[PDB]
């Protein structure tokens, strides 16, 4: 509260560490469904159904231009990528399995880096 603060957690390396994680996600072999924005002209249903599209290129640009105020907003966009994927894709499809795999990969790096 006012004039009463928890000890200051060092957050000076967060930007660098989120970039590293994002690099690891970008280079994973199962990243291909997620590298670029879904083409809303070419994929029926996507525009109407997925209220907040997100992809790795868009996260990389936001990261690079100071549009994440803290590491929680970064994790929210990453998770949005996989939540969108589960909304639109069957679990037993290549893309559906890609998304589960990538979410697992991310969540481990996130825990190991920050928790």
Domains of the chain, earliest start first: 1-115 (1.20.920.10)
Long-range contacts of 96-103 (CB under 8 A, 24+ apart): 97/30, 98/30, 98/31, 98/32, 98/33, 98/34, 99/33, 99/34, 101/30, 102/25, 102/28, 102/30, 102/31, 102/34, 103/79
d(CA 33, CA 55): 9
Provide the 3-class DSSP secondary structure of residue 65.
coil
Residue reference for tokens 């990969």: 105
Count the neighbouring beta carbons within 10 Å of the beta carbon of residue 39.
8
Count the neighbouring beta carbons within 10 Å of the beta carbon of residue 17.
16
- Give the technique used to solve this structure: X-ray
Query: Pseudo-torsion of CA 106, 14, 20, 61, nearest 10°?
Result: 90
Give the largest Cα separation in the chain, rounded. Answer: 54
Q: Which two tokens stand for residue 32?
A: 């291909």
112 with 16: CB under 8 angstroms?
no
């Amino acid at each position: 509260s006012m004039s009463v603060k928890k000890p200051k957690r060092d957050d000076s390396k967060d930007l660098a560490l989120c970039s590293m994680i994002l690099t690891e996600m970008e280079t994973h072999e199962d990243a291909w469904p997620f590298l670029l924005p879904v083409n809303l002209k070419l994929v029926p249903g996507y525009k109407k159904v997925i209220k907040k599209p997100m992809d790795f290129s868009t996260i990389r640009e936001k990261l690079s231009s100071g549009q994440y105020p803290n590491l929680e907003t970064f994790a929210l966009d990453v998770r949005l990528v996989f939540d969108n994927c589960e909304t639109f894709n069957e679990d037993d499809s290549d893309i559906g399995r890609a998304g589960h795999n990538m979410r697992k990969y991310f969540e481990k790096k996130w825990t190991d880096t920050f928790k």
